[PDB]
Structure 1
Amino acid sequence: MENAHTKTVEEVLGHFGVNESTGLSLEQVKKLKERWGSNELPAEEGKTLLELVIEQFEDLLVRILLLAACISFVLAWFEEGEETITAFVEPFVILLILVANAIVGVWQERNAENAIEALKEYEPEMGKVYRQDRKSVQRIKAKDIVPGDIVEIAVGDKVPADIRLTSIKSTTLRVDQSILTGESVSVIKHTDPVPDPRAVNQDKKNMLFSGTNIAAGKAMGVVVATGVNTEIGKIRDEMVATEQERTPLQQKLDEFGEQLSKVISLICIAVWIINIGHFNDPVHGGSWIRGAIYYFKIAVALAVAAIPEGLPAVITTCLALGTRRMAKKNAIVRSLPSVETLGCTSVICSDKTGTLTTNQMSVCRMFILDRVEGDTCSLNEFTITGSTYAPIGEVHKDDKPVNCHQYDGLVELATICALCNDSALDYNEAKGVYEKVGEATETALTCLVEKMNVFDTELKGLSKIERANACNSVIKQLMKKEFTLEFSRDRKSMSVYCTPNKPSRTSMSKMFVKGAPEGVIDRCTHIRVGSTKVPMTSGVKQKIMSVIREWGSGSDTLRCLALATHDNPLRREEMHLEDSANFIKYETNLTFVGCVGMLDPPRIEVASSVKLCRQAGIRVIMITGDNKGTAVAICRRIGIFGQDEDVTSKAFTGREFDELNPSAQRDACLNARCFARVEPSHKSKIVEFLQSFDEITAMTGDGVNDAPALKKAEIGIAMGSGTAVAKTASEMVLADDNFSTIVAAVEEGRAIYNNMKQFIRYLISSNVGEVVCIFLTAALGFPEALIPVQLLWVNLVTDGLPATALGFNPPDLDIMNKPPRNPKEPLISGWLFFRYLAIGCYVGAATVGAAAWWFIAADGGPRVSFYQLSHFLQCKEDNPDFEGVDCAIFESPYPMTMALSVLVTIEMCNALNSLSENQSLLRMPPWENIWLVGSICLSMSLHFLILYVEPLPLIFQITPLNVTQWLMVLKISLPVILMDETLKFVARNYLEGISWPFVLLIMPLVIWVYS
């Protein structure tokens, strides 16, 4: 079987020796599985470790340091260069910081990839098949499907294998196959053979390919290819992927990175220009060229020192951390910008059924008409025991056991619930529970028919499997279902044409209708009392709707459904089923039978999630196709409204929203928290209206009525147990259906943005101090305190791992007590630019003051004055102003070490000021981020290493400091912490000591340092 689309259905069935009615036997599957194997594709890993490394060297800020490493290599090669790496220390330390941040970026991306693919195996994909071990459809694993068995598929499902369509149960089968073909519309399928053997997948209108979704209808067919033999499996190698655009935060940070490179370019040019004067100094041999080459390395080293080279690496590190942290909460994040866009979300539109409620329906109430008087009636209300899908329950008229065979209305009520069903009941022998095959609303009616034996059937010897659809089978053997008018949401009902099998021509044919109570009763012209039908009046209709409204707004919030039948339907040839608009024309002149009410409990974690979302400024709107009274009752249960809150202008229906002027539709979206009776087309209109106010919307849903809205919101979250159509149109999947995970994704996207601002605050406020040091020294006339190899060392130990460790920062304590952030506001605030300059002005002054301290105030050094230090270039033996002072002392490596030690130490303290934007170090101690503490101890260890290991001080042109000089380094470096604690204090108390173990740890050191 290689060209199945060209063969007749009978020929494809005869090929495998399979009957469509029963299915594939057990021993046949064992033979086929031994020959064809598991219905699964080989595990594909995302990216190669090499190509994952090349991705780290893509941004502009990283390419600048690659260019500077080349310039530093060529200049080192034109000079002496007769020696090993000790003469190439400048290019070596530029590449250490590049490969260090590249390792952390690759290591964090590999961890996020492993976490996501380990979540794909959370629940195995299932598939409905017909096999000879059960007379009904059974839910089996998708990987257990063999070529040949009969597979049943309904709307919203995912095609599990290549299938040749055998019969279309509905009127029209629409399939969404954009993943394989590329066309962006539903395809109409049929069951007739196409003649072309070389037909393209577009012309194969009788085949269904794996990985595609059924957009509308119900059908079944024969599997013809599994595993790698499928169309989507044969092209798994030809998987060229479209360019996924970078996150909107990455677009803000690349624009910032490009603007920062322009400021750095002007600064390093100014450094080379303000030093035009002393190019002919005797230190350069009086050569203008060798003096210009030297101050060219000053400008290149200052470019590397000031450029945030770890910025592209820390962006992808925080994003990969957010993807890994969500996978540990069972949340498959497909689109990368989704988790950081969720931090900016302001509205969370949510489906009610299946999404805000555990989709575990069970019919617990139903009523039929007992007797009807003049313009009024009396009901026969019942209650049903059982809340699961198990067919073990009992009907109670008035808290009394009753047999439903007595009531002719209950017999007709169960006939509609059995024949107007596309779902069934399946027993899971592995889990010992009855599962649903189809939708929860229709399965609740299947379980109901089993509990009420309207036709008394002995249930003694029947197994747990045969007990699932025992009472449904005896009803389906009576009436033959001719065709089905599938359920459409513009009509909110579903019809089924049946003819009784026994040929007595008693009630030759009938249509059994079920749907929304208000819409089906509006089309019923009569009512059924027992076995007699009576013309319906307005007083009877008013009482029937009163009980439905009482059930919805009741204590248990019953989801209601009206059941009706049509006594005189048209013939099949008279009905034109070429469209769904004509379906409502046939569902007229019905006779009302009864209503069923099923309970759908809200999820336990929804009430607390709404409480935390409102605390963070996020609004939760319920967009449901269900009744308005039921939706409002769920809202009061899950906390959207209060138990006594007035919801007059906060709860709308589909038509009520349509018949509103733009003035009220403006005031609705900002105030309405519940939308009921809305079609899938209206859900997109609600979401696009909220986006018209520039609000980030996070739509959550599970069904096919949510896919148009899931594609419209900025973020689309799908439930793990929902349909595959909703999961395809979504950027996030709650694999475990945990609604609290959505509130955790919001906090993660807020933490991602916070860890960027702490990164930007650390590198700018620190590298400005490295720029101030070089300009302040040139303005005072002092000897320059840093050579190009010392600027490249302070870049390595301060811009490397200590800066990347800001991405592992803990969340703030008020991270979720703040309103959502506008994604269009500027990246850096004006108040933040002040904090960057205030810290940068101290870092530079402290570094120049450290070298001025040694020349002027230190004991081991000389005692020159401020004048002899600002005019050190004119120091000669013949100078009376310079007496007793050596001119060689101005080339001492002691003040250069004092500046290099203060610069490294003051930036390690500045990184401790970056665990939070406004929280003090007393509230959030440094051990909250153990990655930052370890990175600071590693940077201070490498600094002590180049000071005291035997050959290194000569390489970097420094000198080992003693305890007295190291105490002065700490004396000047520590006040950078007190300065940020003061700026953090003003931000808390004017712009917007808990850890006592930490106070007892630093105070003894503060006393020792300051004596």
Structure 2
Amino acid sequence: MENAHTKTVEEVLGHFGVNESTGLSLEQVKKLKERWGSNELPAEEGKTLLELVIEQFEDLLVRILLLAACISFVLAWFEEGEETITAFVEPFVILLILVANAIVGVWQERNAENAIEALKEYEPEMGKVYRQDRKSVQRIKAKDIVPGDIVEIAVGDKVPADIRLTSIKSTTLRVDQSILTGESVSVIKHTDPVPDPRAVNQDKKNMLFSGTNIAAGKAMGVVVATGVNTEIGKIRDEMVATEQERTPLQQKLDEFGEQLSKVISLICIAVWIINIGHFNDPVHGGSWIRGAIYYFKIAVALAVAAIPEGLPAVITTCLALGTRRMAKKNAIVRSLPSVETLGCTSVICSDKTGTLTTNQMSVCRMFILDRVEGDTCSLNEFTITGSTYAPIGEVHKDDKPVNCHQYDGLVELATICALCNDSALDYNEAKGVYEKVGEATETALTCLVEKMNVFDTELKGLSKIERANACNSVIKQLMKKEFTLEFSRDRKSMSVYCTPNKPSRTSMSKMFVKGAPEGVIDRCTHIRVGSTKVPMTSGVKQKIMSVIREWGSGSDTLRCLALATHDNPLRREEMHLEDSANFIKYETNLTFVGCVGMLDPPRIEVASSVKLCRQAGIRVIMITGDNKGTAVAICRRIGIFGQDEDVTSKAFTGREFDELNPSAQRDACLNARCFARVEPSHKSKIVEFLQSFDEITAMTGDGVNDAPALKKAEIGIAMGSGTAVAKTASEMVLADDNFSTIVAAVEEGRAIYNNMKQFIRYLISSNVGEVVCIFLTAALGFPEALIPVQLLWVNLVTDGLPATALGFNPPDLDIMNKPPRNPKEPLISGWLFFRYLAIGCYVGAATVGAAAWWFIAADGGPRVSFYQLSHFLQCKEDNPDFEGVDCAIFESPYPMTMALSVLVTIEMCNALNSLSENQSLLRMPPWENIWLVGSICLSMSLHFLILYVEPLPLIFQITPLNVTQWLMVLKISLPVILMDETLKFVARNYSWPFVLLIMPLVIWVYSTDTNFSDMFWS
């Protein structure tokens, strides 16, 4: 059945072959069941850990590292029995870091909440259905309802499937459609067809939708769609068809990984070509026997040197620290990688009710009659302060405190509001927040009554439990409700009959009236001025109507609720209380006591957040299921739209949006800033159109309708008092219900992204330095200087501690005044690429020289020959007298610890001057980041431990160093800071206590004058 709302009830009955009270037969129900299925939303299967691990192992960098570990294990098998189990430490440690990365990634991306199964609890467990031929009413589970079936729904019942209403009992059907519109207001429904092929769910008032409870009233209806074909079915389908896409930083890192893999392949091929020169098959030797292990030892070392192993760990640590800061700001973050993507947000999409507003209806304006002029009257307008159901508020007439006891019209209005309401107010001691037991409008009237002590009741020390209803109880003690007249569609008003409790009261019959201004005023024939009744006149009616229209159609489109009372009601026994037609007849001689106006009020922290978003370059677009007028009024109130701003081509509705031209279809999302009366699919389409412009969108909401948009958007935020569907479909939850936390999170994400760029560049520079070192050692043929396990230790511990310290950098001063960054921004620029490539080349050359320094120019150590004996695998016993030295000195740990110490100290110095992108270290000292110096001294302490503890110098081929060699290492390492400062100065042009600290040290280390002898190849 398509467009069931357009067709009449007879047509939709005939199409299904269904009649009232004889809905279906035992075979027709089976045919409809097999044709469609079951009234159920298929759940999402939980993601198993095995598939998560397999997918996370698909990373190219991880794959290269795993291949390196495997080939290292193969090489270690060929190793002799002379060495101990330390030969297998390398594959073990590489596998350990790989599984550590996998486990930390699982911890990062594991969420127990499921987007469908736990969330779709809106489906009723049981519903009275199946008006088949067997009996009358069948209370069978809603799991197996067929589209042809007839359903009856009662008060508090949840609609099982998409139902096209046929008959309405109790004259009113109040439906709560918050899951599809976000509004808790009761939607009065009818059975008349709406003759439009394309209509939003709000326009469809002849249909019932699954998962929506009934505020009041009972009715009968015929199902139209079930299971996936329902509106909640569309919500679930949107919830499952959206797969989270890698954040822009992750895309940049994947591009870097692909580039790194290709350059690894090229460098490995080049090394293999060069290794042919040293080990040539025409030259008689064991080229295959022993040249293979040397080449593959390079390949494993090259792969280890290229991959920044500690980068995922430090990134996770930084994201976890940012998440902890957010949790200290009362905002719990569910996904760490989405913390940084907050900074690059181009557009913020928001839901009006609950997120921008308080979702607590409160009356803000009210007026009564004080003086009546000739064809004119004087309205005593008041304003109510308060946006919460708590009765803490004051009346303001021209912004002055007012005591309502003196005014008699206010007392009458308060009595009418107290008695003519069915709802009430209660206090939750557990939560500490007053909540509405019934309708929002009647609860707002109750709160207004309690705010002003019209009888001057004493509330000096009343408990919060009894403060909720004290004034209402005092009023109700005076007047008792004999009966009530229910709301009706035709009269659009509510009447309550009351009798005074005092036995000697002269007046004994009063009917209070509360309803829509039009009908109530047209049915009003007198005006209540103070305690005196006044005949009505045309001018007073016209001015009252004009005031109502300006209150309900301007900057603050409040819902208008006219009030009245009946001073001469007919006797109770004279009444015929069966039909609603007699109600309007009995409601004809009212006196206009006054009127009130109410709206959903925005929070007291939204407008500032919106203007701060505008300052930072983020556009805040409001998308809501409410009517366009209220949406625009709230937009103007919170500052999205100007008070006098024209919104002809900037505010749209879903029906307007769908029919719009494709070029204008793009243009609307390009320029418009407010969307109202939109389905959840419309919100998803808005977000998708915004993303099509390559813009990161932040969706904020608190309802089920927001969930498809929250999932579709890159980052989704949910309020801490909204539905669990929004909470679990969003990456961030605002526990304190504070909107400024969003701009705070954007600021923290920008700072986090800056720090992440800094330490990513630092780690990549270290890695390229190690790669250049390995390539130089392979090409020259010199004995190895850096072993892969030393590279693991350097890349993980002594780099992650400085990397975390660099992630602890203070943020930029102008961080929140800058526009959002382009998502396609390269992580490395050309000049910075040149800087870090030069640093890496210097690191490689320095490590190679430090290894060669011990071999050739050893001060106090064994001095080998020139670069002629650079090749060392050709050394053998009974050699042609190359030198009278042992051939086993080439494996000594002294050159290896030389290279390790040079690398570590150069990395420490690089961490010192990686504090800033282009600011020199002289301008801002390392003392600014007190974590940086602490992490660096901790890393030096760790290095000294691995040098001087008992077992550790065995795993790493290193030995303790004497003072002279340590000074040589320092002399080699120091010029890196000078080189970085020079490069920074060139970048810039194309404090004193810190400066005086290093002067006594630089002279002391450089005082010794030690020269070299390697000059022939130069």
Short-chain TM bin: 0.5 to 0.7
Q: CA 1:945/1:681 → structure 2, altered by over 3 Å: closer, same or farther?
A: closer
Question: Post-superposition shift, 1:902?
Answer: 1.5
Question: Post-superposition shift, 1:615?
Answer: 4.0
Q: CA 1:361/1:923 → structure 2, altered by over 3 Å: closer, same or farther?
A: farther
Question: Post-superposition shift, 1:736?
Answer: 0.8
Question: Post-superposition shift, 1:731?
Answer: 3.8
Q: Mind listing any 5+ residue stretches in structure 1 that lack a counterpart? A: none
Q: CA 1:655/1:22 → structure 2, altered by over 3 Å: closer, same or farther?
A: closer
Q: CA 1:804/1:289 → structure 2, altered by over 3 Å: closer, same or farther?
A: farther
Question: Post-superposition shift, 1:842?
Answer: 1.7
Paired with 1:291 and 1:724, the residues of 2 have a C-alpha distance of 63
Question: Post-superposition shift, 1:970?
Answer: 1.6
Question: Post-superposition shift, 1:421?
Answer: 5.7
Q: CA 1:789/1:322 → structure 2, altered by over 3 Å: closer, same or farther?
A: closer
Question: Post-superposition shift, 1:966?
Answer: 1.8
Give the conservation status (yes or no) of the 8 Å contact 1:352–1:623. Answer: yes
The answer to which of 760-769 and 909-918 deviates more is 909-918
Give the conservation status (yes or no) of the 8 Å contact 1:284–1:290. Answer: no
Give the conservation status (yes or no) of the 8 Å contact 2:176–2:212. Answer: yes
Question: Post-superposition shift, 1:275?
Answer: 1.1
Q: CA 1:221/1:554 → structure 2, altered by over 3 Å: closer, same or farther?
A: closer
* 1:353-386 deviation digits (Å, cap 9, x = unpaired): 6544666775454124667778755434356688
Paired with 1:250 and 1:849, the residues of 2 have a C-alpha distance of 37
Question: Post-superposition shift, 1:296?
Answer: 1.4
Q: CA 1:79/1:705 → structure 2, altered by over 3 Å: closer, same or farther?
A: closer
Paired with 1:805 and 1:581, the residues of 2 have a C-alpha distance of 77
Q: CA 1:447/1:977 → structure 2, altered by over 3 Å: closer, same or farther?
A: same
Question: Post-superposition shift, 1:308?
Answer: 2.3
Instruction: Give the structure 2 partner of residue 1007 of structure 1.
Output: 1003
The answer to which of 268-277 and 496-505 deviates more is 496-505
Superposition map of 1:54-453 within 5 A: 59-81=59-81, 83-95=83-95, 97-98=97-98, 247=247, 249-279=249-279, 286=286, 288-334=288-334, 338-350=338-350, 354-356=354-356, 363=363, 365-368=365-368, 377-382=377-382, 389=389, 417=417, 423-428=423-428, 435-437=435-437, 442-450=442-450
Give the conservation status (yes or no) of the 8 Å contact 1:250–1:315. Answer: no
Question: Post-superposition shift, 1:761?
Answer: 1.4
* 1:419-477 deviation digits (Å, cap 9, x = unpaired): 88675211456788855446765532122345679999999999976774577689999
Question: Post-superposition shift, 1:289?
Answer: 1.4
Give the conservation status (yes or no) of the 8 Å contact 1:175–1:186. Answer: yes
Question: Post-superposition shift, 1:857?
Answer: 5.7
The answer to which of 103-112 and 851-860 deviates more is 103-112
Paired with 2:881 and 2:490, the residues of 1 have a C-alpha distance of 98
Q: CA 1:181/1:624 → structure 2, altered by over 3 Å: closer, same or farther?
A: closer
Q: CA 1:206/1:80 → structure 2, altered by over 3 Å: closer, same or farther?
A: farther
Question: Post-superposition shift, 1:345?
Answer: 0.9
Q: CA 1:205/1:788 → structure 2, altered by over 3 Å: closer, same or farther?
A: same
Q: CA 1:374/1:675 → structure 2, altered by over 3 Å: closer, same or farther?
A: farther
The answer to which of 466-475 and 902-911 deviates more is 466-475
Paired with 1:45 and 1:729, the residues of 2 have a C-alpha distance of 16
Give the conservation status (yes or no) of the 8 Å contact 1:349–1:622. Answer: yes
Question: Post-superposition shift, 1:326?
Answer: 2.4
Give the conservation status (yes or no) of the 8 Å contact 1:154–1:438. Answer: no
* 1:264-323 deviation digits (Å, cap 9, x = unpaired): 233234323311222379999745311222221221122122222334444444444444
Give the conservation status (yes or no) of the 8 Å contact 1:170–1:486. Answer: no
Q: CA 1:278/1:360 → structure 2, altered by over 3 Å: closer, same or farther?
A: same
Give the conservation status (yes or no) of the 8 Å contact 1:624–1:678. Answer: yes
Paired with 1:983 and 1:579, the residues of 2 have a C-alpha distance of 90
Question: Post-superposition shift, 1:235?
Answer: 22
Q: CA 1:54/1:663 → structure 2, altered by over 3 Å: closer, same or farther?
A: closer
Give the conservation status (yes or no) of the 8 Å contact 2:494–2:513. Answer: yes
The answer to which of 22-31 and 695-704 deviates more is 22-31
Q: CA 1:115/1:100 → structure 2, altered by over 3 Å: closer, same or farther?
A: farther
Question: Post-superposition shift, 1:974?
Answer: 2.4
Q: CA 1:943/1:637 → structure 2, altered by over 3 Å: closer, same or farther?
A: same
Paired with 1:692 and 1:901, the residues of 2 have a C-alpha distance of 51
Give the conservation status (yes or no) of the 8 Å contact 2:155–2:214. Answer: yes
Question: Post-superposition shift, 1:742?
Answer: 0.9
Give the conservation status (yes or no) of the 8 Å contact 1:350–1:699. Answer: yes
Give the conservation status (yes or no) of the 8 Å contact 1:94–1:796. Answer: no
Paired with 1:365 and 1:865, the residues of 2 have a C-alpha distance of 97
The answer to which of 880-889 and 816-825 deviates more is 880-889
Paired with 1:252 and 1:603, the residues of 2 have a C-alpha distance of 38
The answer to which of 226-235 and 433-442 deviates more is 226-235
Question: Post-superposition shift, 1:768?
Answer: 1.4
Give the total of aligned pairs: 1007
The DSSP-based 3-state class of the residue aligned with 1:861 is coil
Q: CA 1:11/1:66 → structure 2, altered by over 3 Å: closer, same or farther?
A: same
Instruction: Give the structure 1 partner of residue 689 of structure 2.
Output: 689
Q: CA 1:680/1:302 → structure 2, altered by over 3 Å: closer, same or farther?
A: closer
The answer to which of 836-845 and 159-168 deviates more is 159-168
The answer to which of 93-102 and 484-493 deviates more is 484-493
Q: CA 1:729/1:346 → structure 2, altered by over 3 Å: closer, same or farther?
A: same
Q: Mind listing any 5+ residue stretches in structure 2 that lack a counterpart? A: 1007-1017
* 1:965-1003 deviation digits (Å, cap 9, x = unpaired): 22222222223233334445566676xxxx666555545
The DSSP-based 3-state class of the residue aligned with 1:528 is strand
Give the conservation status (yes or no) of the 8 Å contact 1:526–1:592. Answer: yes
The answer to which of 510-519 and 841-850 deviates more is 510-519
Give the conservation status (yes or no) of the 8 Å contact 2:624–2:678. Answer: yes
Paired with 2:826 and 2:337, the residues of 1 have a C-alpha distance of 19
Question: Post-superposition shift, 1:74?
Answer: 3.5
Paired with 1:638 and 1:457, the residues of 2 have a C-alpha distance of 36
The answer to which of 286-295 and 811-820 deviates more is 811-820
The DSSP-based 3-state class of the residue aligned with 2:379 is strand
Give the conservation status (yes or no) of the 8 Å contact 1:62–1:309. Answer: no
* 1:37-84 deviation digits (Å, cap 9, x = unpaired): 999999999999999999987755345444433433343233313553
Paired with 1:663 and 1:56, the residues of 2 have a C-alpha distance of 40
Give me the TM-score of the superposition, normalised by structure 1.
Answer: 0.65
Paired with 2:133 and 2:930, the residues of 1 have a C-alpha distance of 58
Paired with 1:861 and 1:636, the residues of 2 have a C-alpha distance of 81
* 1:548-589 deviation digits (Å, cap 9, x = unpaired): 698799999988766699999999999999999999999999
The DSSP-based 3-state class of the residue aligned with 1:564 is strand
Paired with 1:552 and 1:322, the residues of 2 have a C-alpha distance of 45
Give the conservation status (yes or no) of the 8 Å contact 1:122–1:735. Answer: no
The DSSP-based 3-state class of the residue aligned with 1:520 is helix
Q: CA 1:194/1:254 → structure 2, altered by over 3 Å: closer, same or farther?
A: same
Give the conservation status (yes or no) of the 8 Å contact 1:156–1:724. Answer: no
Q: CA 1:701/1:81 → structure 2, altered by over 3 Å: closer, same or farther?
A: same
Give the conservation status (yes or no) of the 8 Å contact 1:280–1:286. Answer: no
* 1:175-222 deviation digits (Å, cap 9, x = unpaired): 999999999999999999999999999999999999998999999999
Q: CA 1:92/1:519 → structure 2, altered by over 3 Å: closer, same or farther?
A: farther
Q: CA 1:847/1:663 → structure 2, altered by over 3 Å: closer, same or farther?
A: same
Give the conservation status (yes or no) of the 8 Å contact 1:405–1:455. Answer: yes
Give the conservation status (yes or no) of the 8 Å contact 2:481–2:499. Answer: yes
Give the conservation status (yes or no) of the 8 Å contact 1:346–1:696. Answer: yes
Q: CA 1:681/1:482 → structure 2, altered by over 3 Å: closer, same or farther?
A: farther
Paired with 1:860 and 1:263, the residues of 2 have a C-alpha distance of 40
The answer to which of 776-785 and 812-821 deviates more is 776-785
Give the conservation status (yes or no) of the 8 Å contact 2:124–2:211. Answer: no
Paired with 1:38 and 1:922, the residues of 2 have a C-alpha distance of 73
Fraction of identical pairs, as percent? 100
Q: CA 1:286/1:305 → structure 2, altered by over 3 Å: closer, same or farther?
A: same
Paired with 2:704 and 2:319, the residues of 1 have a C-alpha distance of 30
Q: CA 1:106/1:475 → structure 2, altered by over 3 Å: closer, same or farther?
A: same
How large is the Cα RMSD of the aligned pairs?
Answer: 11.8
The answer to which of 262-271 and 422-431 deviates more is 422-431
The answer to which of 423-432 and 45-54 deviates more is 45-54
The answer to which of 68-77 and 639-648 deviates more is 639-648
Give me the TM-score of the superposition, normalised by structure 2.
Answer: 0.65
Superposition map of 1:534-553 within 5 A: 543-544=543-544
* 1:321-358 deviation digits (Å, cap 9, x = unpaired): 44433223222334565433322212334456654466
* 1:814-856 deviation digits (Å, cap 9, x = unpaired): 4434321222444544444333312212212222333455566
Q: CA 1:255/1:451 → structure 2, altered by over 3 Å: closer, same or farther?
A: closer
